[PDB]
Amino acid sequence: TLPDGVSAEQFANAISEFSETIGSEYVRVDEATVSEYDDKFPVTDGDEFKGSAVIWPGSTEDVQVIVRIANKYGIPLHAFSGGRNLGYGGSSPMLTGTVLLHLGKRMNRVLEINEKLAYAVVEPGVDYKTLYEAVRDSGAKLMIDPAELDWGSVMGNTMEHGVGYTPYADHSMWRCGMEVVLADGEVLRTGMGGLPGSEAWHLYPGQLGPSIEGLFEQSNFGICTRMGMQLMPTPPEMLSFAIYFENEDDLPAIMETTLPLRIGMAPLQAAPIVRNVTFDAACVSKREEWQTEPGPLTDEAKQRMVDELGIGHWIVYGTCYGPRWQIDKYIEMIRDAYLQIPGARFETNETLPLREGDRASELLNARHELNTGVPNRHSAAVFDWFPNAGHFFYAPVSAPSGEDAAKQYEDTKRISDDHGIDYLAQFIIGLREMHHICLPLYDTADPASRKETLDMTRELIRAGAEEGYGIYRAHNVLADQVAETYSFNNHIQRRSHERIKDALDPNGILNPGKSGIWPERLR
Amino acid sequence: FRTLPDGVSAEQFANAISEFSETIGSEYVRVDEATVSEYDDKFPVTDGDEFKGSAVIWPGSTEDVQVIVRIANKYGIPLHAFSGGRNLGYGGSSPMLTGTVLLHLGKRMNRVLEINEKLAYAVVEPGVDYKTLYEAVRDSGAKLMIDPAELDWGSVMGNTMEHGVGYTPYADHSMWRCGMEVVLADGEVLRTGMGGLPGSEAWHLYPGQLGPSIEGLFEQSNFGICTRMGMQLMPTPPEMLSFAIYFENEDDLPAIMETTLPLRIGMAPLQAAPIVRNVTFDAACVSKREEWQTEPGPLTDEAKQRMVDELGIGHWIVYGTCYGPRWQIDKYIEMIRDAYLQIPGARFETNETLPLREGDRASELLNARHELNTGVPNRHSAAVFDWFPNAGHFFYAPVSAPSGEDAAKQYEDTKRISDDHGIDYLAQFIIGLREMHHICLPLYDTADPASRKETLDMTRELIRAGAEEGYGIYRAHNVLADQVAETYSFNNHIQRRSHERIKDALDPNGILNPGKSGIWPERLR
């Protein structure tokens, strides 16, 4: 494949210059190597979102040279740390023929772990597993904040405004100090890193004038080669809980209970999750175990998952932190509040410890593990729900309100049911905001499921925008439709993003079209 | 006209004033010396025309702001917009360039637009100050508390945009900002984050949207004019109990810092950043200089010792506050007490152990901190203006790695430097979580040209020495902007040059407050 407006000789000359600056063993055009950077969870069938080549730079100097050669020959680039952005297009570029930079392959060192000041400095390739292991080996009484899959890049996940499940869940809030290669090949150090000799680079997200660290999120402005991540100091004790609710109709009550227990950062010291039974089922069992006809999951089938697994139609997971006096008081208030809802049931990772054959204990231990800074790949089990199960995220943000959540659930199961797509649901109250994660399970190998999933997600996006719900994160194929819903004053936001894009990337080199931000030369 | 922007003639300027008058109303466009002089830096450190606006305009709406900005583009007239214009120690309401037209949004755009108890936020216009917002919250009956700076006349919005801070767990004002309406440099209205989505109720809930957040860009910059801003408000805990800890040697500073860091980094038991004040700071809030020293040179060792002994405080005082149920406060207060009381000569009081008494100045100082730390705005710190006749300040505020070895270094160096120039040195350390602000608050004679030159030379002193040791200023007076911006020298000032690329993209005519934070529009470079 080949980037539109670039000839094979123009492309060949860039490749030969990439090969003499980095070494041809690190510049890959062989189909086998480039195939692996295609979207693992596609929802399209042709030559959309296909890389032409992938480069494995080994240093910040390497990245600078590649970027300079890309400007010289006007070759679009797409840089990433892990390339495992499943649900959002993985490692696939926005434009066909884009040259891909997998930084994580070689630039993958944990550079610093600082116990006294409780932060680490990581390169793109450090994933949750490696950092977890590097802290544990250092002896530092610090914990990480991982996402559900331990192969995620600590840096890359940050770049997407990605979140974990401890009090440090908002990764963008705790990143501090980036080394960024700007679109013209120059190195920038954000914050106090701009000051020779300063030890505050990973301490204070500030400097004279405005911070631009936030500019490098879900954006195409720069390539990050090093990043500081602030780490929660390990408390004396941690206790996880599960709360089981009997009824689909309990969803509003669960939200209305949660907001006043979360907003004051106590007794819910971390954002608790609310997932429907289908989500939990899929992490410990296969679909065929519960139904058999290929249609929408019936009420009879869902009911079997609740009874057999001994869980609820909705399940709340959370964790309390500190010494026991605090945990007991906090656990008592959480237990006390939620059990107002008739039929609710409350367990702890002590009352429901991990026992062999007990599935409800296995998926509590999974949440306890993530919530106490231990990464695992337990959610990967959803990929076996059926053969070739993959996902395609609809993730709107709304105010935390009982029947604000009920209509999103009630409208989302309708629209997924109309397309015969399985609907896995996870709600999160951050503090004042509510994330709805619709996690659809569709057959990645069957084009019928691909189109059914795209048409469905495009309908949910009209449905969300119509009800005042905005998507905060979107797959490559959804970028333009979602960008377009932020419509105030003739898309003044997209046009603001675009002025910044043209200021930092005058030549339109970095992953054109990311988040609906198109360079000047592509309008 | 009292002054003129460089490159604009008296008639070119007069023609621009007529259009402002035509579109906003002449009663809201003022060039008279009596009115504009009102808006000169109250704490100047220069003697001439430097930083003197030509006129002041009082817009009454966003739509008025837009019109003013479009006119300024047509006529090529630089603007400097502010909310309350009371940014004392940083240039007050003065602009970077002489002859700049000032926009005082707060005189008429001063409504509290909403108080939401369920979701614990309020929405304010530029004119709303801490006292106003507190009174509006209290009248609402919402169990919410604000986070003020020292002086209640400070603007909620204006302070946030200077990256300013209070003293509750909601101390980081820029953190709890959520949802701005901004007039851009071409007169076009932007709504940040979820404000972009018609119908969204999350505009002041989630500081996010598809793609980059740009709220961060309107901080210590000249890219836009904010007409409306959401500020998330801490829900009121069940109880709050403030404390002061008196330290006997001014050598106790390194021990105070080392004790504090493991108490603060985990957000407990120090639930908010305590401050570490020197004795001269606390004296100035409850007394005048000549009550301890008549001789006008640097404060001698006995003058400080007299302050320590008569007021019944320490050479260093720590002030903090615990929040939550009575069972939580009791556990936290005692970790804090036991940790600090291990410093020999230390004494601990709470606002129950040392309640407000008339004449008990120690009890007044603690009551003032107890008020700020529980969200009750006051002017108690305004007393420093009376330390002597015409006493004003001029901030040196570096940020460093929280280290007792750093704090002593910064204190000893700033003292030796301020003593060389005969300027009083009020010192306050605040330990954020993983970072330490050093606030150097000098007190100089704002009406004396000799003192202004001493203070400016002293601060240029201190910026060179901070830069020498790797201590960077995060906030500086107009007259300090270029020197401070130059300290961020990594890769031939890639930070400054990045600032300017964004400046030129959002302000192609270079209208908005040129030179703010070293960010010069292309046309002046």
Ligand SMILES: *Cc1cc2c(cc1C)nc1c(=O)[nH]c(=O)nc-1n2C[C@H](O)[C@H](O)[C@H](O)COP(=O)(O)OP(=O)(O)OC[C@H]1O[C@@H](n2cnc3c(N)ncnc32)[C@H](O)[C@@H]1O
């Ligand atoms: C299938 C799935 C996915 C998932 C999840 C559960 C399941 C079952 N749970 C998640 C969760 O709890 N939280 C979360 O944030 N994401 C979750 N996901 C999605 C996904 O697995 C993770 O987000 C994953 O960590 C993302 O992959 P990775 O970490 O490898 O990120 P990347 O692909 O390398 O980067 C993503 C994009 O960011 C920009 N980027 C990344 N690095 C750079 C650098 N160095 N410079 C510039 N830009 C960079 C690019 O836009 C890149 O494409």
Ligand SMILES: *Cc1cc2c(cc1C)nc1c(=O)[nH]c(=O)nc-1n2C[C@H](O)[C@H](O)[C@H](O)COP(=O)(O)OP(=O)(O)OC[C@H]1O[C@@H](n2cnc3c(N)ncnc32)[C@H](O)[C@@H]1O
């Ligand atoms: C003398 C003094 C000062 C002081 C202090 C103690 C003393 C004794 N303690 C402070 C503290 O604890 N925390 C803090 O943040 N500041 C403290 N100061 C300094 C000062 O008193 C306050 O910061 C004060 O709140 C600032 O003044 P104000 O609130 O009136 O802000 P402003 O002049 O309107 O704005 C300052 C600058 O911000 C930009 N700005 C402001 N509003 C806008 C709008 N609407 N649009 C665009 N930009 C805006 C401008 O650059 C303006 O100059």
Ligand SMILES: C/C=C/c1ccc(O)c(OC)c1
């Ligand atoms: C099961 C949760 C998936 C997920 C995907 C994207 C996200 O941003 C996210 O935040 C918790 C979660």
Ligand SMILES: C/C=C/c1ccc(O)c(OC)c1
């Ligand atoms: C006495 C405090 C002065 C001060 C000045 C500017 C600041 O940003 C500040 O932060 C606590 C404090």
